[PDB]
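Researcher: Quick test of sequence recovery. Tokens follow.
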């Protein structure tokens, strides 16, 4: 059949460990763009990217910070916050930073207040800076998504 994943087995989590070599860091940072934005960014974005990429490669900032920066990008707002309902962009924010999705109905509604007040910047800030989520997924590890294929096209 047509899918062409076949044996694309992703247990390989991209952990920015303070003690990685240069090439290893390039992989983890590239994959940070690929996990958060699904890879679809202009390279002429730069400047902010260039700084923060040098910092996470310098071990100045960790991947918890770097992922906040990427999931605070104007592109990541414009593609989800506006064309799609906030509740969907909200689920997507949990589905990225937690690398899985939301679970409790209360949780979804609580952070819905946060996305209604300060938008996706304040939402993603609340998700990464929280001690519980910084403990669960970790601060070195890039949010690798569980995915769970949800694409029932046609209605």
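Model:
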């Amino acid at each position: 059949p047509q899918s062409y994943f076949n044996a694309a087995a992703k247990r390989q989590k991209y952990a920015m460990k303070p003690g990685l070599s240069a090439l290893e860091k390039n992989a983890v940072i590239k994959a940070a763009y690929r996990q958060i934005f699904e890879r679809d960014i202009t390279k002429a974005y730069s400047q902010s990217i260039s700084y923060l990429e040098s910092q996470v490669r310098n071990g100045d900032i960790s991947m918890k910070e770097f992922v906040r920066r990427l999931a605070k990008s104007p592109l990541y707002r414009k593609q989800f916050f506006e064309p799609f309902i906030n509740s969907r962009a909200l689920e997507l924010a949990f589905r990225h930073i937690l690398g899985r999705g939301p679970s409790s109905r209360e949780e979804v509604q609580k952070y819905f207040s946060i996305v209604s007040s300060g938008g996706l910047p304040a939402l993603v800030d609340a998700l990464v800076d929280s001690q519980e989520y910084a403990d669960y997924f970790g601060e070195e590890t890039v949010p690798y998504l569980r995915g769970l294929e949800h694409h029932h096209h046609h209605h």
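The chain has eight helices and no strands.
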